[PDB]
Tab-separated table of N, CA and C in Angstrom:
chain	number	residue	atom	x	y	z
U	1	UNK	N	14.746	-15.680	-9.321
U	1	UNK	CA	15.709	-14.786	-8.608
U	1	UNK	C	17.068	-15.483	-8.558
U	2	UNK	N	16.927	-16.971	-7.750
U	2	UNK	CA	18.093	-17.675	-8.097
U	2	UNK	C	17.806	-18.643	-9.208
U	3	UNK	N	16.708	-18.794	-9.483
U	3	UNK	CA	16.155	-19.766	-10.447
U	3	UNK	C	16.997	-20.147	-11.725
U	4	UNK	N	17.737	-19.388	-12.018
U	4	UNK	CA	18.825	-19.288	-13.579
U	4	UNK	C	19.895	-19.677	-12.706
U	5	UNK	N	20.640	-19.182	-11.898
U	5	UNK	CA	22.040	-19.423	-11.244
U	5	UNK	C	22.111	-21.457	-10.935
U	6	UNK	N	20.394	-21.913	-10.340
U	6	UNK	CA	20.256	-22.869	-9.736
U	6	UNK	C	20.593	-23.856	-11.169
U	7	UNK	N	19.136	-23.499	-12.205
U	7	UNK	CA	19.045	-24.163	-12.976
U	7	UNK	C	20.598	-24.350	-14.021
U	8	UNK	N	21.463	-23.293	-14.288
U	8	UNK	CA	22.648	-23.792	-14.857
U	8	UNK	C	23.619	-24.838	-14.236
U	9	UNK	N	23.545	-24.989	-12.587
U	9	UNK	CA	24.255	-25.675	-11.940
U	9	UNK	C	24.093	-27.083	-11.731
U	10	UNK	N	22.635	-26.890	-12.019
U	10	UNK	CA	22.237	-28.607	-12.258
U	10	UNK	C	22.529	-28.938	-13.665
U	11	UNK	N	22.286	-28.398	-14.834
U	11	UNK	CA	22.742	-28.862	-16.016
U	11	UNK	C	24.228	-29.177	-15.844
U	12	UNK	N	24.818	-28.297	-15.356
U	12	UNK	CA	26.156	-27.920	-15.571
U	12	UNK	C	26.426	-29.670	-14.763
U	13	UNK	N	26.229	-30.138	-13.582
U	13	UNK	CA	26.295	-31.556	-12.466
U	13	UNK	C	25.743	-32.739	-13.342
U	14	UNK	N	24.677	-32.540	-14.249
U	14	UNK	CA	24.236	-33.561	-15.450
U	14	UNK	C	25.487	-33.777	-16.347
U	15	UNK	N	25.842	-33.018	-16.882
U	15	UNK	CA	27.254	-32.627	-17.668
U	15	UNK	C	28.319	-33.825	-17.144
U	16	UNK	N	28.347	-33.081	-15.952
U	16	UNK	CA	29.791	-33.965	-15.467
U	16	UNK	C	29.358	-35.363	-15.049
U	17	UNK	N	28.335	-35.902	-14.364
U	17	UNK	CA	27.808	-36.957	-14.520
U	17	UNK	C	28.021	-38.048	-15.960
U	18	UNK	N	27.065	-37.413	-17.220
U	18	UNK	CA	27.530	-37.537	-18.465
U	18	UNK	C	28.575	-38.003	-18.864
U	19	UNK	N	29.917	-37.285	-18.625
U	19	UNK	CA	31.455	-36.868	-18.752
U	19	UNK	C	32.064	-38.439	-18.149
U	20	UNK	N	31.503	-38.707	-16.801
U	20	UNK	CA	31.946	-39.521	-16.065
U	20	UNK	C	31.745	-40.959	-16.693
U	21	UNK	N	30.295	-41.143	-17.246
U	21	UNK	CA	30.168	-42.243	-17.602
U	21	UNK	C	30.312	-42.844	-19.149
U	22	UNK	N	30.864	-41.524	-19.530
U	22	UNK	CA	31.658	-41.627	-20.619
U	22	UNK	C	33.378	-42.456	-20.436
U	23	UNK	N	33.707	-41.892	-19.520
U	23	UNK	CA	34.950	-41.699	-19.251
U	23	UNK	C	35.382	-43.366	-19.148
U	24	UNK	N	34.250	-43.763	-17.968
U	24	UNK	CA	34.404	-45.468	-18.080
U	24	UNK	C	33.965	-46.324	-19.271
U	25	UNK	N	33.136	-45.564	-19.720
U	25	UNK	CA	32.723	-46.538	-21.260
U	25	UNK	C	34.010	-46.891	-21.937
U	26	UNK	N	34.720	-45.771	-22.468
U	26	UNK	CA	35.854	-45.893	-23.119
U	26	UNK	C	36.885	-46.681	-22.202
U	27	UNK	N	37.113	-46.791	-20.677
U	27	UNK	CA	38.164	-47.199	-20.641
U	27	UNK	C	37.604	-49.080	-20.820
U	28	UNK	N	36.285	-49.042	-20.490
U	28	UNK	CA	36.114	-50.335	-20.810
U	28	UNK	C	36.116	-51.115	-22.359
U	29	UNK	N	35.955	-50.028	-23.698
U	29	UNK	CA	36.262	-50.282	-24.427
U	29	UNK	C	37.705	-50.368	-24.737
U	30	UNK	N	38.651	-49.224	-23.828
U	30	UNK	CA	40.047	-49.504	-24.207
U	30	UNK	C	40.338	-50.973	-23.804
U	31	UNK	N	39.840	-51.662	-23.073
U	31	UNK	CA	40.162	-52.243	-22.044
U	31	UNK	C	40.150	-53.569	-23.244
U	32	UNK	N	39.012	-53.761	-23.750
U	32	UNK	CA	38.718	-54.559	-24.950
U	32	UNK	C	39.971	-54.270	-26.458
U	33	UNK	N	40.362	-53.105	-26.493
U	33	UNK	CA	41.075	-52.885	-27.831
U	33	UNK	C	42.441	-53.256	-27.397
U	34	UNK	N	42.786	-52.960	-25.913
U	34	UNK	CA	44.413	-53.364	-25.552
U	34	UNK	C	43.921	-54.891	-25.505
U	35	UNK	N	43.183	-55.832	-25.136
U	35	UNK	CA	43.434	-57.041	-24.666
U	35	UNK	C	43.714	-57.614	-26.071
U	36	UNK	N	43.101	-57.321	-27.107
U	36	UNK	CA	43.137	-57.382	-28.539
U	36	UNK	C	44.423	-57.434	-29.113
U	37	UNK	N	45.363	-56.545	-28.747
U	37	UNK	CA	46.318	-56.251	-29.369
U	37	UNK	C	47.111	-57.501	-28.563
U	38	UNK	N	47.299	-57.141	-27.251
U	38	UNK	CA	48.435	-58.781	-26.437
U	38	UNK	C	47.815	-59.587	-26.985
U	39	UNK	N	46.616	-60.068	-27.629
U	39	UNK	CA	46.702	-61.528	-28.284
U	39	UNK	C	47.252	-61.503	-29.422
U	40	UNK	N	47.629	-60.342	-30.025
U	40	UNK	CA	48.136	-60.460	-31.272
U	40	UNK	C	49.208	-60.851	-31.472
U	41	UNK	N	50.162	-59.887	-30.532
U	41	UNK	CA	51.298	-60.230	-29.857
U	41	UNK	C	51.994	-61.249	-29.572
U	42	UNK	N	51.232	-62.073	-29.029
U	42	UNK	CA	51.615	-63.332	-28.706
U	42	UNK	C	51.102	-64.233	-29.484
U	43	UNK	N	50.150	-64.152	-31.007
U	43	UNK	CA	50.164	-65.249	-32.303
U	43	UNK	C	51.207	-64.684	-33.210
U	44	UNK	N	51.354	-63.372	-33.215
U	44	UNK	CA	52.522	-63.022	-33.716
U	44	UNK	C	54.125	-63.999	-33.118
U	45	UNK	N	54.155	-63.791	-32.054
U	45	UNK	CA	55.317	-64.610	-30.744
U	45	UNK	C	55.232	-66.080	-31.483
U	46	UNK	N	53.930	-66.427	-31.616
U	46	UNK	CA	54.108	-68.027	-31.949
U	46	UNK	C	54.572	-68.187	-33.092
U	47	UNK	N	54.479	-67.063	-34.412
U	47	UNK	CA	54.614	-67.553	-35.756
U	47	UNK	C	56.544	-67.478	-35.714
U	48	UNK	N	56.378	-66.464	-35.088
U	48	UNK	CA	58.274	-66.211	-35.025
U	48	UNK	C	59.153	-67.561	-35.066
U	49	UNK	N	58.400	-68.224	-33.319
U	49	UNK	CA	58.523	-69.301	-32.566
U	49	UNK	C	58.917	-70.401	-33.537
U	50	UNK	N	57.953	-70.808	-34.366
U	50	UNK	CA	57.450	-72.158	-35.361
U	50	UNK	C	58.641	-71.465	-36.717
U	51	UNK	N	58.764	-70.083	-37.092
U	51	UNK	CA	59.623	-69.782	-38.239
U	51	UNK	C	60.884	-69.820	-37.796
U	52	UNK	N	61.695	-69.575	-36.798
U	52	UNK	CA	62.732	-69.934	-36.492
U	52	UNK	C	62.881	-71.407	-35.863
U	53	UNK	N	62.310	-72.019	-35.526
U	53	UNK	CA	62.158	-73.619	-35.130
U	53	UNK	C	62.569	-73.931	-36.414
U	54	UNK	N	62.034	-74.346	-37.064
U	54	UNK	CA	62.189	-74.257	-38.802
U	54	UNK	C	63.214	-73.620	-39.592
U	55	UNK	N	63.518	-72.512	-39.450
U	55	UNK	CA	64.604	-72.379	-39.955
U	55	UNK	C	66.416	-72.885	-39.408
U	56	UNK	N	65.857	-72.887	-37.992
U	56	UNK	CA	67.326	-73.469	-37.488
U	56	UNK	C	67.843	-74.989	-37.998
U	57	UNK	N	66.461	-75.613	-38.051
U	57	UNK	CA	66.272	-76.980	-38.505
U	57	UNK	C	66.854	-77.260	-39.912
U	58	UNK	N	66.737	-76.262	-40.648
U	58	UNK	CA	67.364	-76.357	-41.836
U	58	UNK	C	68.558	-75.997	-42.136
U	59	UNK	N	68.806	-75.162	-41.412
U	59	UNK	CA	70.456	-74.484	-41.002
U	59	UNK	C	71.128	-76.130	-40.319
U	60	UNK	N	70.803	-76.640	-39.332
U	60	UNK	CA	71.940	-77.773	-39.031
U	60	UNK	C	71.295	-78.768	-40.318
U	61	UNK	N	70.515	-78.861	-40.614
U	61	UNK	CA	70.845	-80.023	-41.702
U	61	UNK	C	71.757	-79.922	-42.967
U	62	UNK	N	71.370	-78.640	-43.227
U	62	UNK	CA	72.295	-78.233	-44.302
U	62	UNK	C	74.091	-78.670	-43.702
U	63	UNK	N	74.198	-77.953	-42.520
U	63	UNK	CA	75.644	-78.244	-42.120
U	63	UNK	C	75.719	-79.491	-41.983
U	64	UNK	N	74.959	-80.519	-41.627
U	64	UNK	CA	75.200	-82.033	-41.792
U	64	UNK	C	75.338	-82.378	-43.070
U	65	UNK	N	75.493	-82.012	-43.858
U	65	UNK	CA	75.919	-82.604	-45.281
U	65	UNK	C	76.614	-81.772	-45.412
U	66	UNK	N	76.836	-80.669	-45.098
U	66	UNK	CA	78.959	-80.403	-45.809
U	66	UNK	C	79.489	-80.934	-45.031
U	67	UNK	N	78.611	-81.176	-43.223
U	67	UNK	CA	79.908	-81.982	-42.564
U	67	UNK	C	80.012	-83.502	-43.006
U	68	UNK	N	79.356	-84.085	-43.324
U	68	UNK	CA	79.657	-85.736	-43.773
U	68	UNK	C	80.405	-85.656	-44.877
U	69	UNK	N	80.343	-84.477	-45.790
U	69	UNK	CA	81.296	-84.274	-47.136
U	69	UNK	C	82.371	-83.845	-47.032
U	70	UNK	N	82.773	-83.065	-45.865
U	70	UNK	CA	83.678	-82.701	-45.208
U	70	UNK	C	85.243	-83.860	-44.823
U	71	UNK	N	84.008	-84.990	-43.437
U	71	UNK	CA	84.651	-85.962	-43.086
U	71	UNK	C	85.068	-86.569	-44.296
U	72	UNK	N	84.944	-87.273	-45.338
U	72	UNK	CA	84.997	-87.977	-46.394
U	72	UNK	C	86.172	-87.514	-46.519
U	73	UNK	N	86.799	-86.603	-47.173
U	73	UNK	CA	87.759	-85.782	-47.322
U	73	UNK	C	89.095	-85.721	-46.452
U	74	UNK	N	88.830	-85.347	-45.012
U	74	UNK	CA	89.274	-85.851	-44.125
U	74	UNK	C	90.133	-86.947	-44.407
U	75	UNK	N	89.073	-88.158	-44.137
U	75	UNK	CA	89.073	-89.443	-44.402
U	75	UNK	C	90.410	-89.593	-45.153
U	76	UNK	N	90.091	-89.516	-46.587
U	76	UNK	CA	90.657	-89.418	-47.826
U	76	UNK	C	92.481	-89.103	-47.207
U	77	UNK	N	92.682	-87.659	-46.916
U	77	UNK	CA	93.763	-87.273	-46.489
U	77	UNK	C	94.329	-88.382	-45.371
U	78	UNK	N	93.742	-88.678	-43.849
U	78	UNK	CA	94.248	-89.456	-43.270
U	78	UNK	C	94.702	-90.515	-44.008
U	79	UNK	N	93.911	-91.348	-44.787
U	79	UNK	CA	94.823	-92.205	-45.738
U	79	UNK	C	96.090	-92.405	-46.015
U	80	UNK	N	96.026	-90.995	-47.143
U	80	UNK	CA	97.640	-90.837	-48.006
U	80	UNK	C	98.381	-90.274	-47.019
U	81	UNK	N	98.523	-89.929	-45.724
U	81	UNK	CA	99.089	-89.329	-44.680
U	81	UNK	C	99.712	-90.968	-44.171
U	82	UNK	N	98.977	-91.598	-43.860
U	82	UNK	CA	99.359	-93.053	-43.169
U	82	UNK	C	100.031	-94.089	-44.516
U	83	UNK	N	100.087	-93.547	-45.349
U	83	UNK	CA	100.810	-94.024	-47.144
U	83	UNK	C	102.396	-93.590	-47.019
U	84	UNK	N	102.020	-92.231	-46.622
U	84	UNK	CA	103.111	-91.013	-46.553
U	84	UNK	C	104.295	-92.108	-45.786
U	85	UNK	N	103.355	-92.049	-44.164
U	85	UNK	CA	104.225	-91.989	-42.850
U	85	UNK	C	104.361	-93.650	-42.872
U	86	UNK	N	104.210	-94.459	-43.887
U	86	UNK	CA	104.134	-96.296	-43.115
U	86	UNK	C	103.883	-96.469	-41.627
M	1	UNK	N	81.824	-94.335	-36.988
M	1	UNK	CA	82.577	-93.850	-37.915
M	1	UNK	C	82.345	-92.317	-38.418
M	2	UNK	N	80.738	-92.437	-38.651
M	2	UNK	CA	79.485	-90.871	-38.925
M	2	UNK	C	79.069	-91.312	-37.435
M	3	UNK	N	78.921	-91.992	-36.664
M	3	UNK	CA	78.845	-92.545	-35.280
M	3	UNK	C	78.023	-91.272	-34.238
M	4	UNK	N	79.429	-90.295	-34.239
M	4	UNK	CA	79.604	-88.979	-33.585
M	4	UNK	C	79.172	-87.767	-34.336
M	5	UNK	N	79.344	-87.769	-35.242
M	5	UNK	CA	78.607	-86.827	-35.894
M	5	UNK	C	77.087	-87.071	-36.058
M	6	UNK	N	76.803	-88.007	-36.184
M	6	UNK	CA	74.961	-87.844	-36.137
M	6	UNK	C	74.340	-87.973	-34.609
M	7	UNK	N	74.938	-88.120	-33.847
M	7	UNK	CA	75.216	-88.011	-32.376
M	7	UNK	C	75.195	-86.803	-32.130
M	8	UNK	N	75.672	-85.516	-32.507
M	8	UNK	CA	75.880	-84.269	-31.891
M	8	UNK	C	75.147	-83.483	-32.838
M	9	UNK	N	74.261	-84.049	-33.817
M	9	UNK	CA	73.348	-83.699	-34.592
M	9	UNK	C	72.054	-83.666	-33.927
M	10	UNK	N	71.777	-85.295	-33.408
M	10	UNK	CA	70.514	-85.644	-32.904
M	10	UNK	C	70.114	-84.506	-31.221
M	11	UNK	N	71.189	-84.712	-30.585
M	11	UNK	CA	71.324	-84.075	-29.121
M	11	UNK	C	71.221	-82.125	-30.075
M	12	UNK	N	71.958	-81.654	-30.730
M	12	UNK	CA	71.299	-80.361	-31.192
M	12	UNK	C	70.150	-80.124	-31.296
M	13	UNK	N	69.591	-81.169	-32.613
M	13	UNK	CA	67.977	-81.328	-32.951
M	13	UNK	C	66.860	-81.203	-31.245
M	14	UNK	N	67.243	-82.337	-31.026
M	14	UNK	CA	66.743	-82.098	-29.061
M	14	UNK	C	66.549	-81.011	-29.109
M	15	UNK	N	67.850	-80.153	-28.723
M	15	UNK	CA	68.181	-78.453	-28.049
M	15	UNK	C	66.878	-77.501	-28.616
M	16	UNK	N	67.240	-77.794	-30.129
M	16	UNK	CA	66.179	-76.938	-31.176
M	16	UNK	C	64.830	-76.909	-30.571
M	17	UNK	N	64.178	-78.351	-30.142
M	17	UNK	CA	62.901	-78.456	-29.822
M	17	UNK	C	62.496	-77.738	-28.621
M	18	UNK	N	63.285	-78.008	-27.678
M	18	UNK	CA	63.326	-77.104	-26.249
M	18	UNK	C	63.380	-76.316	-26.441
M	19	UNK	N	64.362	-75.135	-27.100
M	19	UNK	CA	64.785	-73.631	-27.235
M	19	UNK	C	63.240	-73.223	-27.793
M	20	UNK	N	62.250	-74.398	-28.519
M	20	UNK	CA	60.991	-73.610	-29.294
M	20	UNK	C	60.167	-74.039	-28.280
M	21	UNK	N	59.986	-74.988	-27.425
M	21	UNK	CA	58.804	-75.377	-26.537
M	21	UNK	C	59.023	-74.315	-25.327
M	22	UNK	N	59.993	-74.072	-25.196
M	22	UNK	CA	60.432	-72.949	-24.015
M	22	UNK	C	60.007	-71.831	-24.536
M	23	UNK	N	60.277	-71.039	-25.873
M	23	UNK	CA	59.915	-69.798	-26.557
M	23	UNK	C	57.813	-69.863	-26.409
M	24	UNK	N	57.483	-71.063	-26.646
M	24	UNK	CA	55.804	-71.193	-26.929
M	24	UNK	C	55.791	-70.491	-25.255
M	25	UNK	N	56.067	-71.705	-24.566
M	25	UNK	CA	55.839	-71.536	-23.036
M	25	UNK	C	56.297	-69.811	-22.436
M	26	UNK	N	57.111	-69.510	-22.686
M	26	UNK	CA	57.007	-68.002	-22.493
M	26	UNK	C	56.259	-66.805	-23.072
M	27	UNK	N	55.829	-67.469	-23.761
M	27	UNK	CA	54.585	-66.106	-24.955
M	27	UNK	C	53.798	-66.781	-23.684
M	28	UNK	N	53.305	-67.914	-23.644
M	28	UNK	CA	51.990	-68.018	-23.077
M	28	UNK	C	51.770	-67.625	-21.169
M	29	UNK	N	53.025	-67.168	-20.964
M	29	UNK	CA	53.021	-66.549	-19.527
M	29	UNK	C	52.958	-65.146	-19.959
M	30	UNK	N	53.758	-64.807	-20.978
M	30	UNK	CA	54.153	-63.016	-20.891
M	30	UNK	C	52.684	-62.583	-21.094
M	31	UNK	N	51.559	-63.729	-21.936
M	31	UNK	CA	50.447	-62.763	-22.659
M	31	UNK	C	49.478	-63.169	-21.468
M	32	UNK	N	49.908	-63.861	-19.968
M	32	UNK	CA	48.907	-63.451	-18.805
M	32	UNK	C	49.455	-62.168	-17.854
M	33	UNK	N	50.674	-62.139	-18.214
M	33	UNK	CA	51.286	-60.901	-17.494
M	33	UNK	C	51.041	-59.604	-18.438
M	34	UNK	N	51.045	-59.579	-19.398
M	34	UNK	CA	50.049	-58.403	-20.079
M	34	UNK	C	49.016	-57.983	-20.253
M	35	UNK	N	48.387	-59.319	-19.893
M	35	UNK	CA	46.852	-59.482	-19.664
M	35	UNK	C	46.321	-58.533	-18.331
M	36	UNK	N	47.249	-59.117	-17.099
M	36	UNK	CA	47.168	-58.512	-16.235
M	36	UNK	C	47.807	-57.043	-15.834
M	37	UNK	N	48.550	-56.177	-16.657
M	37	UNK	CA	48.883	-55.020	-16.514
M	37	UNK	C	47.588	-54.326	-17.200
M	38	UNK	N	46.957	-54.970	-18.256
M	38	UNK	CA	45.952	-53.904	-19.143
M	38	UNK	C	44.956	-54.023	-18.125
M	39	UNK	N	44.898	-54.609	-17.134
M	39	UNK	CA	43.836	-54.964	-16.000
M	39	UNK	C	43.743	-54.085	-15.269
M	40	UNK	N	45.296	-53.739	-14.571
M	40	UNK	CA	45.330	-52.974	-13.873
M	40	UNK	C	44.876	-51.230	-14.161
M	41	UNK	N	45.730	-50.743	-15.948
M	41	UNK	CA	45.523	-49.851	-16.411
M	41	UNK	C	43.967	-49.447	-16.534
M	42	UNK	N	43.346	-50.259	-16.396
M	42	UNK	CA	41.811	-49.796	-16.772
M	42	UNK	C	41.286	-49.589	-15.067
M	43	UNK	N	41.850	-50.867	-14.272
M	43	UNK	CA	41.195	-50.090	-12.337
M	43	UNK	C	41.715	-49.048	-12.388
M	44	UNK	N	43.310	-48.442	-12.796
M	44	UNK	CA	43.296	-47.027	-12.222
M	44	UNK	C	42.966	-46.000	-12.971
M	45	UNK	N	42.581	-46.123	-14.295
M	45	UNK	CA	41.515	-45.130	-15.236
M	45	UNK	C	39.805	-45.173	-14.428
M	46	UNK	N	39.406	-45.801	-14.442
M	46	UNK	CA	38.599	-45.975	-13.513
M	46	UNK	C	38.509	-44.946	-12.444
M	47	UNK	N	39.595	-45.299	-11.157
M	47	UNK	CA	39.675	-44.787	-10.293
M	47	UNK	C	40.149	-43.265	-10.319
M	48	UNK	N	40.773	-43.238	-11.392
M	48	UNK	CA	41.092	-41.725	-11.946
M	48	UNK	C	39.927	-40.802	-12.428
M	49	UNK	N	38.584	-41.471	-12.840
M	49	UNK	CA	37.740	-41.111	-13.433
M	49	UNK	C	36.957	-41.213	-12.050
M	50	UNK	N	36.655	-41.467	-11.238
M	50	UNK	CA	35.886	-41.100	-10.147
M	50	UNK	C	36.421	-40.101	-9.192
M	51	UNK	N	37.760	-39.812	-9.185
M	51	UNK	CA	38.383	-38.938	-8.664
M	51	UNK	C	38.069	-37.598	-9.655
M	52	UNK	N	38.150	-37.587	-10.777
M	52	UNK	CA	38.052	-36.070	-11.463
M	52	UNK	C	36.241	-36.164	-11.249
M	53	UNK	N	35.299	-36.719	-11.670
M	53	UNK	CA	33.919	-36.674	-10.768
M	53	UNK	C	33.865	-35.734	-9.857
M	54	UNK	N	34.646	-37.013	-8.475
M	54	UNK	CA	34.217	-35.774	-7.053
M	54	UNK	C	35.011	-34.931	-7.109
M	55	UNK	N	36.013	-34.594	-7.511
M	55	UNK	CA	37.040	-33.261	-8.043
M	55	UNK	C	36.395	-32.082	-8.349
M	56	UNK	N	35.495	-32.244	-9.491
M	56	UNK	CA	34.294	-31.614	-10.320
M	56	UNK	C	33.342	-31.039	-9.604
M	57	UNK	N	33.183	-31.870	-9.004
M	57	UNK	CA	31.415	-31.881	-7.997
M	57	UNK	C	31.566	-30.979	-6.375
M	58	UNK	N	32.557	-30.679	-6.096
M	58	UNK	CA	33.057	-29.986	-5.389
M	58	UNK	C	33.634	-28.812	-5.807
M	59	UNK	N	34.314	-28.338	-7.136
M	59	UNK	CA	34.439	-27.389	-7.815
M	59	UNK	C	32.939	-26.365	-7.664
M	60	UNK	N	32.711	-27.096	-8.511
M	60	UNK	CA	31.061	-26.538	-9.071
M	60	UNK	C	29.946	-26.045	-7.962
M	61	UNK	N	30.365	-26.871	-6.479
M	61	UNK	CA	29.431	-26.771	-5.598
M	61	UNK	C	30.088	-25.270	-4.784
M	62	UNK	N	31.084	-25.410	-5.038
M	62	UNK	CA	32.112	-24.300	-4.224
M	62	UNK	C	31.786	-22.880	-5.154
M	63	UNK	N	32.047	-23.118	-6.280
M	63	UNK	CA	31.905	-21.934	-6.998
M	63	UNK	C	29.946	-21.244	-7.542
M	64	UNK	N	29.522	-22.206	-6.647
M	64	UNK	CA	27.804	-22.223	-6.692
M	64	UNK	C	27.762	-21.178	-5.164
M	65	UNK	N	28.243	-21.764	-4.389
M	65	UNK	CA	28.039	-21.135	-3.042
M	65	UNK	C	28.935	-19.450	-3.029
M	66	UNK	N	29.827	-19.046	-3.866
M	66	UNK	CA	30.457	-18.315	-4.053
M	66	UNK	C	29.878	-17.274	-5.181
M	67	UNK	N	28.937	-18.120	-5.974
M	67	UNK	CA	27.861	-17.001	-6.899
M	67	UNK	C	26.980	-16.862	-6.030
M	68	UNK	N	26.170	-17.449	-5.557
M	68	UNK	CA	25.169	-17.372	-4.392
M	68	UNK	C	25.356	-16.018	-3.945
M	69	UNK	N	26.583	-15.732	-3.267
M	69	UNK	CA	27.186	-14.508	-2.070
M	69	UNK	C	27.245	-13.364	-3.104
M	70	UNK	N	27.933	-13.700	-4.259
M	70	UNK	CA	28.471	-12.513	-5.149
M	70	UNK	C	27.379	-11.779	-5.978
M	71	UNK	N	26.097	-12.666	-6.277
M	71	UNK	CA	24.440	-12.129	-6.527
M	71	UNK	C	23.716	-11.220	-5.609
M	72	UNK	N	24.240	-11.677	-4.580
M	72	UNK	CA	23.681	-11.230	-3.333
M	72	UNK	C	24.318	-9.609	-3.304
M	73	UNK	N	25.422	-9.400	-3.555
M	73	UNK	CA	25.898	-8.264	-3.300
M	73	UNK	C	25.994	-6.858	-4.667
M	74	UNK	N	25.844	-8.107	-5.832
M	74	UNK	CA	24.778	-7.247	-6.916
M	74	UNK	C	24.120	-7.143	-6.879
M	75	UNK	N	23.197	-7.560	-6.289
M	75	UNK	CA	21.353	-7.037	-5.952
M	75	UNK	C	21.147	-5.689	-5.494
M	76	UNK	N	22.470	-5.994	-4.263
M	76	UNK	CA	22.297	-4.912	-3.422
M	76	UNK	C	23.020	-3.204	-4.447
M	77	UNK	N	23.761	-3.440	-4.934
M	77	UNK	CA	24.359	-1.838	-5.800
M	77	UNK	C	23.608	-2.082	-6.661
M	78	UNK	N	22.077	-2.769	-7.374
M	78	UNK	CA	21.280	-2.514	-8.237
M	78	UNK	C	19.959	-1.779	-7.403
M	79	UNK	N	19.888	-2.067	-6.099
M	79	UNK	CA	18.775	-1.601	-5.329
M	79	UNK	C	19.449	-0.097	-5.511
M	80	UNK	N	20.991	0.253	-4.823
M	80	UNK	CA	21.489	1.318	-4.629
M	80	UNK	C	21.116	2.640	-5.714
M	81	UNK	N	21.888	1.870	-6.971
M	81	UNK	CA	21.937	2.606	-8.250
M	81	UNK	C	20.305	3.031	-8.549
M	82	UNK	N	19.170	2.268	-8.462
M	82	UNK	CA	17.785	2.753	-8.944
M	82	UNK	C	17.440	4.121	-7.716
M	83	UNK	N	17.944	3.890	-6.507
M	83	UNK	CA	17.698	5.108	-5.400
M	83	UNK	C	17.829	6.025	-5.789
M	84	UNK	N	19.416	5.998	-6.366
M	84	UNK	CA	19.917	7.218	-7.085
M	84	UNK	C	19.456	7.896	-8.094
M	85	UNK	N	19.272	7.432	-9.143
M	85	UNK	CA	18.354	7.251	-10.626
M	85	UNK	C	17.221	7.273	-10.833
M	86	UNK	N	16.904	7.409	-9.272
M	86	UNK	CA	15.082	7.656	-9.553
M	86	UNK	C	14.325	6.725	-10.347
């Protein structure tokens, strides 16, 4: 009599039950796929870190040898300047 | 003579190392402070997901008690209609 009305309402409460513990599965798997990604993030962060460490390193060395080739030059001029001026 | 110039070389070189031990040292705070936002994002999925639950479960119970009444009052114009109809 109510037997159909009853019985859909409990399937229907299984359902959402179901639904629910779905709902946390995934966020606990999201939970696993985001933590995944910030570590990436941050070995990514480190390679940057170590490639620009490195490259700056080569940037002032390089400028240390036009600047010592530089001074030389310099040098050179102060000379014939103090030749110039006795 | 190169005195000063490898002097403001060496104190750069320094700078370089810091500017990268400081860059390491900040990945390795930002990726506990991201750590801890994906933390949070999953308690309030969570808590969002137990809220649509009892959300649900009160829907369903409401609209159960509301078929209940509305059966009840088709029963009754099916008793009516067979009176009529012989």
């Amino acid at each position: 009599s109510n037997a159909g009305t009853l019985q859909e309402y409990q399937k229907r409460m299984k359902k959402l039950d179901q639904q629910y513990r779905e709902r946390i599965r995934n966020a606990e798997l999201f939970l696993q796929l985001e933590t995944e990604q910030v570590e990436r993030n941050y070995i990514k962060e480190k390679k940057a870190a170590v490639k620009e460490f490195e490259d700056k390193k080569v940037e002032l060395k390089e400028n240390l040898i036009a600047e010592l080739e530089e001074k030389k030059k310099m040098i050179e001029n102060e000379k014939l300047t103090m030749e110039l001026t006795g």
